[PDB]
Amino acid sequence: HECRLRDMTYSAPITVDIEYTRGSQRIIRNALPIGRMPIMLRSSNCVLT
């Protein structure tokens, strides 16, 4: 309802843990935003369920 009033989307940010190499050194991650998925109402992640 707050998203309805404020005229903004109702989405959840995507977290990701990955691994890569910068100087041939394995650097790992734990939580990195990559985007936002719109959350359908009364879904598993929705607060209304």
Binding site: S24, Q25, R26, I27, I28, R29, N30, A31, L32
Partner: protein, 111 residues
């Protein structure tokens, strides 16, 4: 393709990072007899930073410069006292004193 050459390392998880903004340049400390030999080298050669840095393999040029500036700021009286007295340039006995300082610092590290 390497085989078991690098190990995984966790670094910079993309959180709020502290603003260090400091580069603490590592400077080797100064000993008592090291300060005395630096003072005698100054008195024998003058204020030539290049020559002093050449005959100081255990030190650096910027370290010698910082030490000279600190001495001129704090113990200018001793600086002038050393500059008034003169001593001829010695090479063989200077190398012998360098070896003695090497042995002394080795004994100090053994302690």
């Amino acid at each position: 393709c390497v085989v078991e050459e690098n190990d995984p390392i966790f670094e910079r998880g993309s959180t709020t990072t502290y603003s260090s903004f400091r580069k603490n340049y590592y400077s080797k400390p100064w000993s008592n007899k090291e300060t005395d030999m630096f003072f005698l080298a100054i008195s024998m050669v003058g204020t030539d930073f290049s020559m002093i840095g050449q005959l100081f393999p255990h030190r650096a040029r910027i370290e010698i410069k910082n030490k000279f500036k600190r001495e001129e700021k704090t113990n200018g009286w001793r600086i002038d006292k050393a500059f008034q007295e003169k001593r001829p340039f010695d090479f063989d006995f200077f190398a012998h004193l360098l070896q003695k300082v090497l042995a002394e610092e080795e004994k100090r590290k053994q302690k």
